RNA sequence: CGGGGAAUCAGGGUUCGAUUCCGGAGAGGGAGCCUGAGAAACGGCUACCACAUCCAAGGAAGGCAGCAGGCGCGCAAAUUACCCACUCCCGACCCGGGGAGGUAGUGACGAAAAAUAACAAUACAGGACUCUUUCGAGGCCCUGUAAUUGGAAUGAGUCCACUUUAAAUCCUUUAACGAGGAUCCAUUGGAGGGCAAGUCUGGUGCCAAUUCCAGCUCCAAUAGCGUAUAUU
């Protein structure tokens, strides 16, 4: 599908970076 | 009616199955593979060993003409009509032409509305040869199209309805068969023709059942020489039912004991990467040892390929129909 | 001869070096910890700090009753005091060098909005600002990056003709009311 | 040993000025004798003819067959040849064409493998070569 | 063309300034004038030089480095639009005129702001805290990921009206319609030697290595990102 773009996937990037 | 699509079909699955299959095509369980394939031979090299160009020349290469050099024919002759001047009709007068012989129905054309263009040749124009152009297929139709069927060409002021061959647009000295005009890649139509000297542009059509031209390929004529070559690559293939140290027993090749005999000095390859020499047959079944430089796994397909030397016909029709108007379907 | 001005400003600086790792986790850090959009807005942010220490250095290198030491370093001091982002008790130009970008972050409209509990989250307080649903002491706010001020802090109200505010249904809801 | 009185500053700039003429780069930005020596006349792109396809071989060790273009420049009518991404995107050049053509990269200096190449095609038809290889564009002849 | 000035900036320097402000110069190249307070004036005249227009062949007429527009040149640059409403200027003048100027059009030169989703339940995965030596229990929380559901919110658009304005457009303001594959679908480059990022796949040839081609996966910046050239 998809990828979200914006600020949507800097969020998804930090999630996936920092949180886990 | 009915047997027009069944046709279509047919082609359809036959560009599927040489497309996910290169060149596989099955051995005949009832004619000698010596004698169906009499007139193949096998190459170790299928780039760098070479292949005697005036071997084996048909009748129609006796009906065309041949260049020396066809690079100093083109500069003399583009030398001589930039440079010097004949004593003709130049540019900017409204002239008349008295020309021998025409048909008739020409002059009933130009009643209806259909433009009347002529133009003077050039010199070594009107001589037939053999013309090799590259064409890509243009996105907007799919359908497939066998080699050595009729297509309507535009070559350069010049429209012919004639059958080329297509192949491979290679840095080699022979290029491979292509049965089907792949609609990815830039191939090679080879055709007789009435000699272009390049640069022109090279429009494909198809005849549609309802008077259409659909356009197909697009394109420059590469050159005028009878010496390229195109090259049909068969596959015959087997299974290893027997595997040992760097020697297997192979299945499926042959059904006779000679066959193996007279395709004995062929190479073989396989779909893994190993290759492989004929060592000598079982008996009267096709069964046959081969020696491999590894090992081979109970998955892998033995494989070897038969080459032939294929040229055009002799489809030349300079007459082509007038189209009904183009619609999308 | 044209009636039309021609100044204007980059307000960001590419860093120098564009791959490192720990510049690139840290303005990631940033990034996700206040819900912001690309890494454009921490360099704005980050231009605006060097700035602002820059100038307060250069008022650093001058003897002590300088006039224009004395004014201007008291200006800047107001500024950023009045900003939020200094305290009134650190009224010191020294203690100017001592800023970090998060304080500076933290005075925007976004994380405000985050802060005082009207959204969710901060990408959901990023949502509501743009969507016309903030308002400061009357007037609606659609930028996310508007730098609260300390007297316009207990004046973060919910914009009278929201829907969550004073009462008009949008679309969708007015829509499916309409279904049933 | 440098002078450093405080009277020696005609010295200083006249040793300063001649010493700057000892340099390459201030020689060729300076000399005027490189822009009326560059084909491409001070310019970063230039139109051509294409006059035919070459082909140069590569460096020794990786052995290769590169094709390039020969090309004569419109405004000042040098002969140069340009260098093409791949062997497809040949297909769509041809002899008496107009294109237009760059440097290859590194600011005047020739290619680490392909020796004595200097420019790349970036136009033909006054289309380009990378809308063209993605079908994104048709060029006209 | 010079200057005010622009870029980079530890400090010194270096590079750029044709270009709206100031001063100068020219009006195809030279030259000589008339009038006038002021001109060696060219949207004044008179010749020569170079081009070039109409012609009934006697003659007559020419100057876009003004605004548009064309050709040529080239890597390289916009409408043959509307108006004296604003700023000012000129005249005999409170009233006339002004391609000065203004307003639209073209415009990814460049600079600023800023969408491409948010939340809740459910299901798994981690992290805390209470009770247990632990396993374990937490209608104990927190945080992520969804071929899972759910209505809430909104602009992009379509389009009444007002406002805008000389008349309009745009913006702003507001009716009505306008979001689940919210298909209302973000690009551009690079990575399997070194700065950010690969123990991957499939075709195609040489004697397992090895040319060419298509991909997947990852990384960076993001409404922008490559390239070339010059320069710092």
């Known amino acids: 599908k998809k990828k979200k773009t914006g600020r949507a996937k800097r969020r998804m990037q930090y999630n996936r970076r920092f949180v886990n | 009616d009915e047997e027009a699509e069944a046709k279509m079909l047919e082609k359809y699955k036959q560009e599927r199955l040489e497309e996910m299959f290169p060149d596989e095509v099955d051995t005949p369980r009832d004619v000698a593979a010596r004698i169906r394939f009499q007139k193949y031979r096998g190459l170790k090299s299928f780039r760098t060993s070479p292949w005697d160009p005036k071997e084996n020349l048909p009748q129609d290469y006796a009906r065309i003409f041949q260049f020396q050099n066809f690079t100093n024919t083109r500069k003399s002759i583009f030398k001589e009509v930039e440079e010097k001047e004949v004593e003709g009709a130049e540019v900017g007068w409204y002239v008349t032409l008295h020309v021998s012989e025409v048909p008739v129905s020409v002059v009933e054309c130009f009643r209806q509305g259909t433009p009347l263009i002529a133009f003077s040749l050039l010199p070594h124009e009107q001589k037939m040869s053999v013309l090799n152009m590259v064409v890509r297929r243009d996105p907007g139709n799919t359908e497939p199209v066998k080699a050595k069927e009729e297509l309507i060409f535009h070559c350069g002021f010049r429209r012919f309805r004639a059958s080329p061959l297509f192949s491979q647009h290679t840095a080699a000295d022979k290029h491979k068969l292509q049965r089907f005009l792949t609609a990815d890649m830039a191939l090679v139509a080879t055709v007789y023709a009435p000699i272009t000297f390049p640069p022109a542009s090279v429009l494909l059509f198809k005849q549609k059942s309802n008077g259409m031209h659909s356009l197909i390929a697009t394109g420059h004529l590469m050159s005028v020489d009878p010496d390229r070559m195109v090259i049909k690559r068969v596959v015959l293939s087997g299974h290893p039912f027997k595997i040992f140290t760097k020697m297997a027993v192979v299945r499926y090749m042959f059904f006779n004991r000679e066959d193996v005999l007279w395709f004995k000095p062929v190479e073989l390859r396989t779909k893994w990467g190993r290759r492989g020499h004929i060592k000598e047959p079982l008996g009267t079944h096709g069964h046959m040892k081969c020696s491999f430089d590894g090992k081979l796994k109970s998955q892998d397909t033995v494989l070897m390929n038969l080459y032939k030397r294929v040229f055009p016909k002799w489809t030349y029709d300079p007459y082509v129909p007038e189209p009904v108007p183009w619609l999308k379907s | ?180 | 040993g440098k002078c450093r009185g405080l009277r020696t500053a005609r010295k200083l700039r006249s040793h300063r000025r001649d010493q700057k003429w000892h340099d390459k780069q201030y020689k060729k930005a300076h000399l005027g004798t490189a822009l009326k020596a560059n084909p491409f006349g001070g310019a970063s792109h230039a139109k051509g003819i294409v006059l035919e396809k070459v082909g140069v071989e590569a460096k020794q060790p990786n052995s290769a067959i590169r094709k390039c273009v020969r090309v004569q420049l419109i405004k000042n009518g040098k002969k140069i040849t340009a260098f093409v991404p791949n062997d497809g995107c040949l297909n769509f050049i041809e002899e008496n064409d107009e294109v237009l053509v760059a440097g290859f990269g590194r600011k005047g200096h020739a290619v680490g493998d392909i020796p004595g190449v200097r420019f790349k095609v970036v136009k033909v038809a006054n289309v380009s070569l990378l809308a063209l290889y993605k079908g994104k564009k048709e060029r006209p002849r």
């Not at chain 3, 807005?41 to 650093?60: C, Q, Y």
């Not at chain 3, 300088?66 to 982002?85: H, S």
């Not at chain 3, 009357?138 to 316009?152: A, C």
Request: aromatic content about 8%.
């Open chain 3, 1 to 180: 001869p044209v009636a039309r001005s021609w100044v204007c400003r980059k307000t960001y600086v590419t860093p120098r070096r564009p791959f490192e790792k720990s510049r690139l986790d840290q303005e990631l850090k940033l990034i996700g910890e206040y819900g912001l959009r690309n890494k454009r807005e921490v360099w704005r942010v980050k231009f605006t700090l060097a700035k602002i220490r820059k100038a307060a250095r250069e008022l650093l290198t001058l003897d002590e009753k300088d006039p224009r030491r004395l004014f201007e370093g008291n200006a800047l001091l107001r500024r950023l005091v009045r900003i939020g982002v200094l305290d009134e008790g650190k009224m010191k130009l020294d203690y100017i060098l001592g800023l970090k970008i998060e304080d500076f972050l933290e005075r925007r409209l976004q994380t405000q909005v985050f802060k005082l509990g009207l959204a969710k989250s901060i990408h959901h307080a990023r949502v509501l600002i743009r969507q016309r649903h903030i308002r400061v002491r009357k007037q609606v706010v659609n930028i996310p990056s508007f730098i609260v001020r300390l007297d316009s802090q207990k004046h973060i109200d919910f914009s009278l003709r929201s829907p969550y505010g004073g009462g008009r249904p949008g679309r969708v809801k007015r829509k499916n009311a309409k279904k049933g």
